C-alpha cells in the first residue's frame, strides 16, 4: 500500500473507545476480550513474543522502541528473583488522553494484556501505575480486576492455564515525571519520583530490584488482539516499521476535539479534517501543530500539508510522533506564549535531580517569559538555542530532552516572530 487512513471499524481494536457499550466483563467478552486466552497462554512466551515481533508493534508511551525486542529482554532463565510487568498508566504528557479512555471504557483489554504480556515476560504479577488524578478511572479498572479475579481469568491458575498471575493497581500522587519508566519504578518503591541512571536496565534490576518491564497502557492493551488475530494482521496497517493502528488525540483549535483510532501513517491533514471537523476557521487558518504531545517540536502549516503520522515520517519533519497527541494552533494564537507555557510546565515537572534540567529548564523558562513580552535582544535567541543543546543529551532522563525540543521547534520555525516581538518592545521603550 501507499495510502493510509480510512480504518474500518472491524479493524479497530478499541471497539469501546467512547463508552457506549458495557465496559464491565459481560460487555468486554461480548466484544471479543478474554477469548481463547488459555490457548494463548499455553502457546508459550516464545510464541507470544514471536507474534509481537511479527506485528511490528512499537512503544506507544512516546519513545517508540520495538516492543517485541524489548519484551524479549525478560525471556531469560530465573535467577531467583520475582519478575514483574509494570504498566505505565501515568498518562501525563500534555495533549495526551488516550490511555484514560482505555482504562475506563476498555479496562478488560488492559487486564488481559497484562496477563498475556506478563506470560511472555515470565512475570508473576503486573503493577499498573495510574496517575492519582485519574481516581474514577482507577476505580473502574479496579472493579474490572475484581470481575477478572472472580471469573478465574487472573490469579491462581489463570484462565485454567496453570499460570499464577496477579494484577495490582497503585495510584500516583501528582507528578508528570513519574511517567518516566525508572521514576515510575522508584515511585512504586515509595521514594520520590526521580529517574535512575542506566545501566542497570530495568530488565536486570527494576522494581524492588528485580527483573522488570515497563510498558505503556496502549502497548499492553493491544497485545491480546495481536495474538488472537496475528502479528501479520497488525503489520498490514501502516508503513513498514510503522505498523498497526494508533489512538490519536486532536485538541486545541479544531472544531470537534476528540479521541479516535486510525491507521498509522495517515496524513496529518486527513486526520484533522476527517475526525476533528477541521481547523477552526478553516485549514488556511492553521498556524502550527504539535504532532506528538508537548515534548515534540512543533511543525508549521507548510509542513503539515503532507506529513504522515508515523515515527519515521515525523522524524524527517524534524519532530516526532510521540504519544500521537495533536495540539492544533490556529492563526490567532500567540505561538511564543503557547510554547512559553509548555516550558513553564516542564519547569514545574522537573524532578530536580540532575543539574542541566534542574537549573537549565528554569533558566529557559525565564528567558521564554521575556521573549513573550519582547524584553530581550536578538542575540539572546541564539543564546537560548545553545542553552537548550546543553540540556538535551546531558541529563539523566528524557524530560530534559522534552524541554529542549519545544524551544528548538519555536526557534526553528518562528524566529521572525520572536525578533519582531523584540523590535516592538524596543520602540515602546
Amino acid at each position: 500500500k501507499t495510502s493510509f487512513g480510512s480504518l474500518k471499524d472491524e479493524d479497530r481494536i478499541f471497539t469501546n473507545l467512547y463508552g457506549r457499550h458495557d465496559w464491565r466483563l459481560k460487555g468486554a467478552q461480548s466484544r471479543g476480550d478474554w477469548y481463547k486466552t488459555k490457548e494463548i497462554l499455553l502457546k508459550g512466551p516464545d510464541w507470544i513474543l514471536g507474534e509481537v515481533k511479527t506485528s511490528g508493534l512499537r512503544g506507544r508511551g512516546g519513545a517508540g522502541f520495538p516492543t517485541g525486542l524489548k519484551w524479549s529482554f525478560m525471556n531469560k532463565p530465573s535467577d531467583g528473583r520475582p519478575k514483574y510487568l509494570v504498566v505505565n498508566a501515568d498518562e501525563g504528557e500534555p495533549g495526551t488522553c488516550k490511555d484514560r479512555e482505555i482504562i475506563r471504557h476498555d479496562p478488560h483489554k488492559l487486564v488481559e494484556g497484562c496477563l498475556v504480556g506478563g506470560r511472555a515476560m515470565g512475570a508473576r504479577a503486573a503493577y499498573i501505575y495510574i496517575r492519582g488524578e485519574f481516581y474514577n478511572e482507577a476505580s473502574n479498572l479496579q472493579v474490572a480486576i475484581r470481575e477478572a479475579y472472580e471469573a478465574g481469568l487472573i490469579g491462581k491458575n489463570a484462565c485454567g492455564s496453570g499460570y499464577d498471575f496477579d494484577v495490582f493497581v497503585v495510584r500516583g500522587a501528582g507528578a508528570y515525571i513519574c511517567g518516566e519508566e525508572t521514576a515510575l519504578i522508584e515511585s512504586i518503591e515509595g521514594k520520590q519520583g526521580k529517574p535512575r541512571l542506566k545501566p542497570p536496565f530495568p530488565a536486570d534490576v527494576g522494581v524492588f530490584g528485580c527483573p522488570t518491564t515497563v510498558a505503556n497502557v496502549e502497548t499492553v492493551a493491544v497485545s491480546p488482539t495481536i495474538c488472537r488475530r496475528g502479528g501479520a494482521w497488525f503489520a498490514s496497517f501502516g508503513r513498514e516499521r510503522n505498523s498497526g493502528t494508533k489512538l490519536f488525540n486532536i485538541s486545541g483549535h479544531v472544531n470537534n476535539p476528540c479521541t479516535v483510532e486510525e491507521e498509522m501513517s495517515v496524513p496529518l491533514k486527513e486526520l484533522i479534517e476527517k475526525h476533528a471537523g477541521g481547523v477552526t476557521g478553516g485549514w488556511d487558518n492553521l498556524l502550527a501543530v504539535i504532532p506528538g504531545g508537548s515534548s515534540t517540536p512543533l511543525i508549521p502549516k507548510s509542513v503539515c500539508e503532507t506529513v504522515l503520522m508515523d515515527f519515521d515520517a515525523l522524524i524527517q519533519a524534524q519532530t516526532g510522533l510521540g504519544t500521537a497527541a495533536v495540539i492544533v494552533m490556529d492563526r490567532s494564537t500567540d505561538i511564543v506564549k503557547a510554547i512559553a507555557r509548555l516550558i513553564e510546565f516542564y519547569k514545574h515537572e522537573s524532578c530536580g535531580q540532575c543539574t542541566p534540567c534542574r537549573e537549565g529548564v528554569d533558566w529557559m523558562n525565564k528567558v521564554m517569559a521575556r521573549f513573550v513580552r519582547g524584553d530581550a535582544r536578538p542575540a539572546e535567541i541564539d543564546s537560548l538555542w545553545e542553552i537548550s543543546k546543553q540540556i538535551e543529551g546531558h541529563t539523566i532522563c528524557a524530560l530534559g530532552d522534552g524541554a529542549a525540543w519545544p524551544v528548538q521547534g519555536l526557534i526553528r520555525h518562528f524566529r521572525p516572530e520572536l525578533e519582531e516581538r523584540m523590535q516592538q518592545f524596543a520602540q515602546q521603550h
Binding site: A379, E380, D382, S383, W385, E386
Partner: protein
C-alpha cells in the same frame, strides 16, 4: 608667555630660535583636569553564543 617684547627678542636672538612658538612651560593648550566619563568597549569574547571557551 608674559615676557616683554624686548626680552622675547633678546632671548630669541641669543638662542637663534623662535622660542615663543614652542614654550617649555604649559598654559591653556593642555587638556581639562575634569573629563566626561568614558564608555569603554568590550573585547571580542563578549558574546552570548558561538563562544565556547575551548575554542579560544
Amino acid at each position: 608667555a608674559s615676557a616683554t617684547r624686548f626680552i622675547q627678542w633678546l632671548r630669541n636672538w641669543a638662542s637663534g630660535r623662535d622660542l615663543q612658538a614652542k614654550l617649555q612651560l604649559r598654559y591653556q593648550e593642555i587638556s581639562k583636569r575634569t573629563q566626561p566619563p568614558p564608555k569603554l568597549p568590550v573585547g571580542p569574547s563578549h558574546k552570548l553564543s558561538n563562544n565556547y571557551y575551548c575554542t579560544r
